[PDB]
């Protein structure tokens, strides 16, 4: 799998998820170079807190990389793509990227998905695997110590978390449980699917979505503001992590490991590894899956899923001097010594290759950390450039997290997802100029709104007014046109 005769040494900026760098000795990196003689060395700044500003800072500086990488990247990777910051792939994808040009092959959605105005592909994307993203978790050992069953629909949603809260589940004599905690801020935000609005088109938090035919923000919609009504009220009763906003990464390490959380909307497969991971240290600890709660609207709503492809990856900077062993490099990630290591690790060290696939081992199988944070302490299952594989997840997802999954399929509760939409030139560069201004303000005035520190009426009209001086309709316009031109 060598691409190149002399070892090359490239550059790479790649922070990612606010918490995490590129290593040069990660084992998969560490087996990445061993593999493809490339090594990559990290020029971003480890104790910065914040992806996005990083990258920003990074384009500030004028001084370029060879490569950049992380998550929520593809906007900018477009953007300063065209404006000659990033090179165009499509080229070296053809002449000398076999298996991504094979990829793009059997998914012309995909290469359509990540394409800028220019026809260009500035970046080469991370490929999730999977159907399913997240659904509800609850705590059944609270539910028999109360006596009570699952909750179906919102009112026995409120009823059983007021029991959470009000009749010590624990047992410790304390109120101090904590009825919904989620290690994801922006779940807080989703709470107002159960009353029937949606807070995102996609896995991407705050995404647009198709509404027959038309083009909407969801928390431009009046249904938002209803919904953050009920959830600044859950707030208010503590029913809700008075610390959602900023507890954040280890929140389910924290508050199930520590006897306070009752309930979630998290991934199955890692969420569930919780029940043997707290087994020893929580006795009874029972996380169930279970289906949507009926909203006030009379469905069952789960409006994560899974993506075809995340709006990250990695990309070649003009600065890079060898873009042709880097194209060769990125297309490792495609090919299945590629792809085993990227989703499985080291080889002896995480897996083994057993009847021509990679299979974990125990060691990492019964760990009380989920099997995909191992790998990302490892450099593995990272937001670069590579296509994931199912089989990876399949592997240490338990047959109880297996029953929520097919529960979830069968119930036809996930909700189609926002595939993007196609813009012009200049469709783009206005939501360039808006969305993500736009965006930040949707985020301080949501966080307000669930906590206290905003009324959502008494703030709703003066909030639709930034909305549109802030340019959000014409963004949505923009889109739409770009809508009509596909429907
Ligand atoms: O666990 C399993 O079962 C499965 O997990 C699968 O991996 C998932 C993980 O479970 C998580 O879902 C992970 O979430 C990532 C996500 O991909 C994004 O990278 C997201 O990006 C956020 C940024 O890190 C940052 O917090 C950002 O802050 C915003 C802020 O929200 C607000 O907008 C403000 O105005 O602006 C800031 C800003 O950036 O300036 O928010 C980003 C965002 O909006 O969410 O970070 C999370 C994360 O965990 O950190 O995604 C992976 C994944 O691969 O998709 C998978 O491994 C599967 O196989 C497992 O079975
Ligand atoms: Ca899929
Ligand atoms: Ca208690
Ligand atoms: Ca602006």
Same mark, same amino acid.
């Given at each position: 799998?060598?691409?190149?005769?002399?070892?090359?040494?490239?550059?790479?900026? /790649?922070?990612?998820?606010?918490?995490?760098?590129?290593?040069?000795?990660?084992?998969?990196?560490?087996?990445?170079? #061993? &593999?493809?003689?490339?090594?990559?060395?990290?020029?971003?700044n480890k104790a910065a807190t914040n992806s996005q500003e990083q990258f920003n800072l990074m384009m500030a500086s004028g001084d370029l990389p060879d490569v950049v990488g992380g998550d929520n990247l593809?906007?900018?990777?477009?953007?300063? %793509?065209?404006?000659?910051?990033? +090179?165009?792939?499509?080229?070296?994808?053809?002449?000398?990227? !076999?298996?991504?040009?094979?990829?793009?092959?059997?998914?012309?959605? +995909?290469?359509?998905?990540?394409?800028?105005?220019?026809?260009?592909?500035?970046?080469?994307?991370?490929?999730?695997?999977? +159907?399913?993203?997240?659904?509800?978790?609850?705590?059944?050992?609270? &539910?028999?110590? &109360? $006596?009570?069953?699952?909750?179906?629909?919102?009112?026995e949603l409120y009823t059983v978390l007021k029991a959470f809260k009000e009749k010590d589940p624990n047992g410790n004599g304390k109120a101090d449980e904590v009825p919904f905690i989620d290690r994801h !801020?922006?779940?807080?935000?989703?709470?107002?699917?159960?009353?029937?609005?949606?807070?995102?088109?996609?896995?991407?938090?705050?995404?647009?979505?198709?509404? $027959?035919?038309? *083009?909407?923000?969801?928390?431009?919609?009046?249904?938002?503001?209803?919904?953050? =009504?009920?959830?600044?009220?859950?707030?208010?009763?503590?029913?809700?992590?008075?610390?959602?906003?900023?507890? =954040?990464?280890?929140?389910?390490?924290?508050?199930? %490991?520590?006897?306070?959380?009752?309930?979630?909307?998290?991934?199955?497969?890692?969420? /569930?590894?919780?029940?043997?991971?707290?087994?020893?240290?929580?006795?009874?600890?029972?996380?169930?899956?279970?289906? !949507?709660?009926? $909203?006030?609207?009379?469905?069952?709503?789960?409006?994560?899923?899974?993506?075809?492809?995340?709006?990250?990856?990695?990309?070649? @900077? +003009?600065?890079?001097?060898? !873009?042709?062993?880097?194209?060769?490099?990125?297309?490792?990630?495609?090919?299945?010594?590629?792809?085993?290591?990227?989703?499985?690790?080291?080889?002896?060290?995480?897996?083994?290759?057993?009847?021509?696939?990679? *299979?974990?081992?125990?060691?990492?199988?019964?760990?009380?950390?989920?099997?995909?944070?191992?790998?990302?302490?490892?450099?593995?299952?990272?937001?670069?450039?590579?296509?994931?594989?199912?089989?990876?997840?399949?592997?240490?997802? @338990?047959?109880?997290?297996?029953?929520?999954?097919?529960?979830?399929?069968?119930?036809?509760?996930?909700?189609?997802?926002?595939?993007?939409?196609?813009? @012009?030139?200049?469709?783009?560069?206005?939501?360039? =100029?808006?969305?993500?201004? *736009?965006?930040?303000?949707?985020?301080? /005035?949501?966080?307000?709104?669930?906590? %206290?520190?905003?009324? *959502?009426? =008494?703030?709703?009209?003066?909030?639709?007014?930034?909305?549109?001086? #802030?340019?959000?309709?014409?963004?949505?316009?923009?889109?739409?046109?770009?809508?009509?031109?596909?429907?």
């Amino acid at each position: 799998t060598w691409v190149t005769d002399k070892p090359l040494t490239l550059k790479i900026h /790649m922070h990612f998820r606010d918490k995490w760098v590129w290593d040069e000795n990660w084992p998969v990196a560490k087996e990445s170079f #061993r &593999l493809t003689n490339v090594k990559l060395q990290s020029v971003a700044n480890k104790a910065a807190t914040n992806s996005q500003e990083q990258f920003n800072l990074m384009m500030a500086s004028g001084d370029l990389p060879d490569v950049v990488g992380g998550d929520n990247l593809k906007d900018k990777f477009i953007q300063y %793509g065209q404006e000659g910051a990033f +090179v165009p792939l499509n080229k070296l994808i053809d002449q000398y990227a !076999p298996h991504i040009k094979a990829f793009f092959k059997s998914h012309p959605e +995909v290469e359509r998905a990540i394409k800028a105005p220019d026809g260009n592909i500035y970046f080469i994307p991370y490929v999730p695997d999977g +159907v399913v993203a997240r659904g509800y978790f609850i705590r059944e050992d609270w &539910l028999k110590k &109360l $006596n009570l069953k699952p909750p179906q629909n919102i009112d026995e949603l409120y009823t059983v978390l007021k029991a959470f809260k009000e009749k010590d589940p624990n047992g410790n004599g304390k109120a101090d449980e904590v009825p919904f905690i989620d290690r994801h !801020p922006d779940e807080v935000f989703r709470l107002v699917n159960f009353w029937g609005a949606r807070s995102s088109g996609s896995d991407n938090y705050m995404d647009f979505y198709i509404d $027959n035919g038309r *083009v909407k923000h969801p928390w431009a919609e009046t249904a938002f503001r209803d919904g953050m =009504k009920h959830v600044a009220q859950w707030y208010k009763e503590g029913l809700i992590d008075k610390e959602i906003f900023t507890r =954040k990464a280890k929140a389910r390490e924290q508050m199930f %490991g520590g006897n306070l959380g009752g309930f979630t909307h998290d991934w199955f497969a890692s969420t /569930m590894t919780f029940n043997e991971g707290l087994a020893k240290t929580v006795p009874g600890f029972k996380l169930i899956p279970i289906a !949507p709660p009926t $909203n006030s609207k009379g469905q069952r709503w789960e409006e994560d899923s899974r993506q075809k492809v995340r709006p990250d990856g990695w990309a070649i @900077t +003009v600065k890079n001097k060898n !873009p042709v062993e880097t194209i060769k490099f990125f297309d490792f990630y495609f090919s299945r010594p590629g792809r085993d290591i990227s989703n499985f690790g080291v080889p002896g060290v995480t897996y083994d290759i057993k009847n021509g696939k990679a *299979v974990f081992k125990d060691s990492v199988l019964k760990s009380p950390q989920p099997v995909n944070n191992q790998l990302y302490d490892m450099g593995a299952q990272i937001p670069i450039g590579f296509w994931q594989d199912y089989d990876y997840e399949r592997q240490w997802t @338990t047959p109880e997290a297996q029953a929520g999954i097919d529960m979830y399929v069968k119930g036809k509760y996930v909700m189609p997802g926002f595939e993007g939409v196609n813009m @012009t030139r200049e469709e783009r560069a206005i939501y360039d =100029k808006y969305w993500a201004d *736009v965006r930040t303000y949707m985020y301080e /005035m949501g966080q307000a709104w669930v906590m %206290g520190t905003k009324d *959502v009426d =008494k703030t709703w009209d003066e909030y639709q007014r930034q909305l549109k001086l #802030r340019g959000l309709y014409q963004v949505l316009q923009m889109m739409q046109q770009a809508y009509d031109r596909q429907y």
